[PDB]
Amino acid sequence: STAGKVIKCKAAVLWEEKKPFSIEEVEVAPPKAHEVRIKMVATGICRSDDHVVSGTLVTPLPVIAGHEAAGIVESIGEGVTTVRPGDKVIPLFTPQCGKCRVCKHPEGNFCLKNDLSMPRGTMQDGTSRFTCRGKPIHHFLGTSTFSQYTVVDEISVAKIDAASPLEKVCLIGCGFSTGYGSAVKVAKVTQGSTCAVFGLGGVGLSVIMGCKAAGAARIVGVDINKDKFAKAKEVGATECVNPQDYKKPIQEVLTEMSNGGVDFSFEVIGRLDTMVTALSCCQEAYGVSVIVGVPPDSQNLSMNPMLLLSGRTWKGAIFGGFKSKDSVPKLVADFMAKKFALDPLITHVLPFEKINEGFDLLRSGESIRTILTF
Amino acid sequence: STAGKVIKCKAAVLWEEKKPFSIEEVEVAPPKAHEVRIKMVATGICRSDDHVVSGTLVTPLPVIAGHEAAGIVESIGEGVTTVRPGDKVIPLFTPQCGKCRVCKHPEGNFCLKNDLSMPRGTMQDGTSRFTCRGKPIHHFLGTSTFSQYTVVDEISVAKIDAASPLEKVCLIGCGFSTGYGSAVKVAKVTQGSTCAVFGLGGVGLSVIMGCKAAGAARIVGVDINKDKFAKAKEVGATECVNPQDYKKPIQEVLTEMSNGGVDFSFEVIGRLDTMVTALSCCQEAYGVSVIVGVPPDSQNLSMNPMLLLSGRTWKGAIFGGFKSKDSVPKLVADFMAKKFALDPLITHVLPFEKINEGFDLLRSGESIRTILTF
Numbered sequence: 001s002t003a004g005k006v007i008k009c010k011a012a013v014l015w016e017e018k019k020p021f022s023i024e025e026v027e028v029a030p031p032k033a034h035e036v037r038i039k040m041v042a043t044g045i046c047r048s049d050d051h052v053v054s055g056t057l058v059t060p061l062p063v064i065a066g067h068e069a070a071g072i073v074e075s076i077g078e079g080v081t082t083v084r085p086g087d088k089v090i091p092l093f094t095p096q097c098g099k100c101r102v103c104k105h106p107e108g109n110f111c112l113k114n115d116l117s118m119p120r121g122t123m124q125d126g127t128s129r130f131t132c133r134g135k136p137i138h139h140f141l142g143t144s145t146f147s148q149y150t151v152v153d154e155i156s157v158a159k160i161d162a163a164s165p166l167e168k169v170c171l172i173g174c175g176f177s178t179g180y181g182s183a184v185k186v187a188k189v190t191q192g193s194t195c196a197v198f199g200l201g202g203v204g205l206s207v208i209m210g211c212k213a214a215g216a217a218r219i220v221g222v223d224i225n226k227d228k229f230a231k232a233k234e235v236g237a238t239e240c241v242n243p244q245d246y247k248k249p250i251q252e253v254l255t256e257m258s259n260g261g262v263d264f265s266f267e268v269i270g271r272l273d274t275m276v277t278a279l280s281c282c283q284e285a286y287g288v289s290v291i292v293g294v295p296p297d298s299q300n301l302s303m304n305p306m307l308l309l310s311g312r313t314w315k316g317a318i319f320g321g322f323k324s325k326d327s328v329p330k331l332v333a334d335f336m337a338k339k340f341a342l343d344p345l346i347t348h349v350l351p352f353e354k355i356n357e358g359f360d361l362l363r364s365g366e367s368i369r370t371i372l373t374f
Numbered sequence: 375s376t377a378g379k380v381i382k383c384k385a386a387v388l389w390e391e392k393k394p395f396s397i398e399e400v401e402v403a404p405p406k407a408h409e410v411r412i413k414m415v416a417t418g419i420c421r422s423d424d425h426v427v428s429g430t431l432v433t434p435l436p437v438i439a440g441h442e443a444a445g446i447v448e449s450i451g452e453g454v455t456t457v458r459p460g461d462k463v464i465p466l467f468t469p470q471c472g473k474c475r476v477c478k479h480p481e482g483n484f485c486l487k488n489d490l491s492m493p494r495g496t497m498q499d500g501t502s503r504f505t506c507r508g509k510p511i512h513h514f515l516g517t518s519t520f521s522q523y524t525v526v527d528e529i530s531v532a533k534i535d536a537a538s539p540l541e542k543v544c545l546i547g548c549g550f551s552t553g554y555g556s557a558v559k560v561a562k563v564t565q566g567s568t569c570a571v572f573g574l575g576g577v578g579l580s581v582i583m584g585c586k587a588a589g590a591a592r593i594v595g596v597d598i599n600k601d602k603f604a605k606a607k608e609v610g611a612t613e614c615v616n617p618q619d620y621k622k623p624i625q626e627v628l629t630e631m632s633n634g635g636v637d638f639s640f641e642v643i644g645r646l647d648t649m650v651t652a653l654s655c656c657q658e659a660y661g662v663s664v665i666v667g668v669p670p671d672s673q674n675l676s677m678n679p680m681l682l683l684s685g686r687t688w689k690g691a692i693f694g695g696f697k698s699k700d701s702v703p704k705l706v707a708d709f710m711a712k713k714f715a716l717d718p719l720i721t722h723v724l725p726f727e728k729i730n731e732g733f734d735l736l737r738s739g740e741s742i743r744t745i746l747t748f
């Protein structure tokens with residue numbers, strides 16, 4: 001009996017940059033054709049959400065952010081075939097339309113229907129399902145998970161195992177899959193290799209997990225916050241370095257440590273300077289560097305192309321290279337079979353209503369992932 | 375007999391930047407342990423040699439340049455086991471020491487003994503075999519082929535088929551292998567793909583040869599000199615575009631031509647701006663761009679890392695990614711077995727004494743490869 005009707009619920013609206021979220025009532029329209037309305041159960045706080053607040057990641061405001069989440073289908077629009085009411089789902093911030101050249105390519109995952117490259121903050125049909133104070137509110141990457149209910153396009157949701165613990169598997173919606181995929185699928189880390197991981201947050205820890213899973217012999221965590229080192233070691237870093245401890249630039253320090261440069265490096269921070277540092281620290285003839293961090297809006301890095309000419313490979317990826325709708329349910333199934341751990345990422349749990357405290361935790365450096373429960 | 379004696383012979387000496395080569399008598403010392411003295415038969419004029427004249431590529435002066443060549447072993451130093459007097463040989467401007475981490479890596483070819491990264495202009499032992507008017511003259515890339523005789527370290531020479539035509543196979547010493555391997559080995563061009571090739575000189579044409587050999591369905595040549603188009607089509611380009619003919623940036627043109635970006639792009643010129651254009655023109659989620667051209671000394675490019683974050687791969691390579699001493703003899707054998715052609719790269723054959731005229735042809739846009747014959 002909410003099917004076909006507007007739902008009034010609480011969401012965290014961001015009206016302005018650099019301000020707290022406003023927990024307040026919104027109206028959520030029912031799903032149109034090929035849309036899905038989801039009752040949220042749990043959502044994680046990803047740095048990319050914070051980037052919306054800071055202006056690092058530009059997307060139209062006002063907005064309902066959130067993109068790392070899981071919930072339960074409340075209703076489906078006309079013509080939906082891939083989920084039903086009552087299904088456990090994870091919203092897919094990178095869609096999988098299944099029809100575009102990228103979806104059809106064996107390697108590609110950054111589906112042409114994404115709202116990340118040139119964000120509009122809408123549904124696929126260019127409109128919004130959200131009203132607050134009588135004003136339309138933008139969506140974020142097609143997911144908008146900081147709301148008790150959201151509406152997503154069908155291509156931006158995956159059905160997952162009905163017995164899944166949603167307060168854990170929400171991390172498969174972003175941080176875990178992004179970092180793990182970046183190591184295992186994008187870099188294709190090899191047995192016995194030396195890896196350097198720049199940034200030891202939720203995503204960088206997942207990178208580490210991926211490097212360890214792939215059989216790396218050495219995994220060097222790099223962070224200016226030495227509080228991050230203990231957990232990085234727990235999940236597989238063999239050693240951790242703080243650039244602030246050294247007189248020399250850290251690329252030189254890592255090249256020394258690795259007797260001439262690492263096999264694989266990862267930038268999991270979002271700074272221009274560290275993207276160049278991470279490239280430079282990989283071995284000049286055969287090293288691979290993967291950019292994971294989201295850079296500040298519209299800013300260009302500067303680098304010497306001789307870093308590449310010698311033989312380095314530089315690449316980046318969204319969501320760990322995973323084709324999202326195919327991969328997310330498999331990732332869940334693998335989690336249920338204990339093929340990887342999510343608890344090491346979860347440092348704090350809060351009710352949704354304490355979302356701003358969650359953000360304070362991230363900004364302070366204290367948390368890895370805070371999971372909010374609805 | 376000349377073995378064990380100083381040879382006085384003719385060479386093309388570059389006394390300073392931006393000046394013609396001086397053709398005159400030099401003295402060539404006999405080879406020391408693990409060194410090989412070669413009588414040159416044919417040497418090609420590569421743009422990288424002109425980059426030494428122009429200061430684009432910094433290496434100590436005065437110098438005997440030249441790196442794309444073939445000749446016949448005159449004598450060997452103590453300890454040499456891989457060639458003997460009378461052998462046809464190609465000097466290897468990228469060595470293969472076989473002991474360094476790079477030589478031992480299955481993909482790597484930029485051996486740590488190279489003189490390209492931090493040019494010293496000497497033999498491996500840090501001395502020179504050349505004197506002219508009483509003055510020591512530097513080596514170039516461990517090769518120095520603009521001389522009737524040179525001396526090279528054993529790791530910088532490969533024995534080739536005794537029946538080889540040296541006036542053709544000299545191109546396996548640089549231009550052909552560099553382009554062909556950039557397509558087949560570094561990019562790993564796939565069947566039915568779309569490729570864009572920036573720069574249609576000897577190296578860009580060889581890239582086209584490789585993209586054709588790998589089964590690309592479309593090969594778009596890009597050059598500002600439309601005189602280069604006819605030969606590019608002969609060797610496999612399906613269409614050629616001149617950026618000066620368009621009101622829009624060529625990346626935009628190529629993206630529209632390829633219905634959302636190319637599978638593989640190659641920068642084969644050596645300009646910072648075209649390196650970025652080439653990257654940008656490959657499909658954002660799965661495209662691969664390879665830098666082949668040698669950029670001007672010490673200059674940085676600027677780019678937006680979102681070009682990589684979406685999924686692009688950017689890489690570069692020296693000498694087509696070929697491990698030099700293993701590959702060069704196989705390449706010559708494949709040529710002898712008609713697996714690829716070299717004649718489409720040769721536009722001019724001059725005596726060595728007309729070296730300057732050969733360089734004027736390159737600079738004027740009139741030639742592809744000029745081969746100088748001793």
Ligand SMILES: NC(=O)c1c[n+]([C@@H]2O[C@H](COP(=O)([O-])OP(=O)([O-])OC[C@H]3O[C@@H](n4cnc5c(N)[nH+]cnc54)[C@H](O)[C@@H]3O)[C@@H](O)[C@H]2O)ccc1-n1cccn1
Pocket residue numbers: 046047048049051067093174175178198199200201202203204222223224225228243268269270271274291292293294295317318319320365367368
């Ligand atoms: N590519 C994706 O799909 C993607 C990208 N992001 C981006 O990854 C970065 C990391 O996110 P996080 O792990 O959630 O972030 P933090 O917890 O803040 O960890 C960062 C880590 O870096 C350290 N650090 C800061 N500054 C430095 C310097 N200078 N040196 C060394 N270390 C440093 C901090 O101390 C901290 O521990 C973010 O950029 C993020 O935006 C995340 C996930 C996905 N994505 C894309 C769209 C939505 N989500």
Ligand SMILES: NC(=O)c1c[n+]([C@@H]2O[C@H](COP(=O)([O-])OP(=O)([O-])OC[C@H]3O[C@@H](n4cnc5c(N)[nH+]cnc54)[C@H](O)[C@@H]3O)[C@@H](O)[C@H]2O)ccc1-n1cccn1
Pocket residue numbers: 420421422423425441467548549552572573574575576577578596597598599602617642643644645648665666667668669691692693694739742
């Ligand atoms: N990576 C290596 O091992 C390598 C590198 N190089 C470098 O490749 C570039 C091409 O060399 P080339 O084919 O010998 O050069 P040209 O015959 O001059 O061809 C260039 C081609 O480019 C066109 N052009 C100029 N400007 C433009 C613009 N703006 N748009 C499009 N086209 C443009 C010209 O008209 C001309 O047709 C060089 O940088 C070279 O250094 C070669 C070989 C090997 N190497 C490494 C060490 C030694 N040799």
Ligand SMILES: [Zn+2]
Pocket residue numbers: 095096097098099100101102103111112113
């Ligand atoms: Zn798609």
Ligand SMILES: [Zn+2]
Pocket residue numbers: 046047048049067068174175
């Ligand atoms: Zn995220």
Ligand SMILES: [Zn+2]
Pocket residue numbers: 469470471472473474475476477485486487
């Ligand atoms: Zn070596």
Ligand SMILES: [Zn+2]
Pocket residue numbers: 420421422423441442548549
């Ligand atoms: Zn060359």
